């Protein structure tokens, strides 16, 4: 029941500062423009200990399946090849991605009827809010 309140289909409704976050991550112009337009659905499910987070959109489709605390390989929507570890900390999914000597942290939390995704790279944060589909 660890992630019960995250499970579902969630549609992006707002994004703040995503362009500056993407710049900090190293995403190039064209990818920033196309990624910034899209309105993905994030689909979260749990089967035993395995959590799956998918995104479906007009830009990219992504899928990660993982066990909390167990590092895995991920191909991000912007085509970084990263090493990811996701844990639960105080009810928040905390996802660290490591690549090329760099790191970014993505937090996913349930707040009211939303799923809030906060992405941080160095001093730059972006907030993306998703609602039930």
Question: Is 130 flagged in the annotation as binding?
Answer: yes
State which residue, 48 or 101, has the beta carbon closest to ligand QN6.
Answer: 101
Residue count, binding to ligand QN6 (CB under 6 A): 19
Q: Are 114 and 130 in contact (CB under 8 A)?
A: yes
* Candidate ranges 1-9, 51-59, 65-73, 86-94; the one touching ligand QN6 (CB under 6 A): 51-59
Measured between alpha carbons, how far is 49 from 111 in angstroms, rounded to an integer? 23
Instruction: Collect contacts of 54-61 with beta carbons under 8 A, ≥24 apart.
Output: 59/34, 59/35, 60/35
Q: Which residues bind ligand QN6 (CB under 6 A)?
A: 22, 25, 27, 35, 38, 40, 42, 55, 57, 59-60, 62, 76-78, 106, 117, 119, 128
């Amino acid at each position: 029941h660890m992630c019960d309140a995250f499970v579902g289909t969630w549609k992006l409704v707002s994004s703040e500062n995503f362009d500056d976050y993407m710049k900090e991550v190293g995403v190039g112009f064209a990818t920033r423009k196309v990624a910034g337009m899209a309105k993905p659905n994030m689909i979260i499910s749990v089967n035993g200990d395995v959590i799956t987070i998918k995104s479906e959109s007009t830009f990219k489709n992504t899928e990660i399946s993982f066990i909390l605390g167990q590092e895995f390989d991920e191909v991000t929507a912007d085509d970084r090849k990263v090493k990811s570890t996701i844990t639960l900390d105080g009810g928040v999914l905390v996802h660290v991605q490591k690549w090329d000597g760099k790191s970014t942290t993505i937090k996913r939390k349930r707040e009211d009827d939303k799923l809030v995704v906060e992405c941080v790279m160095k001093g730059v944060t972006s907030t993306r809010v998703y609602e039930r589909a």
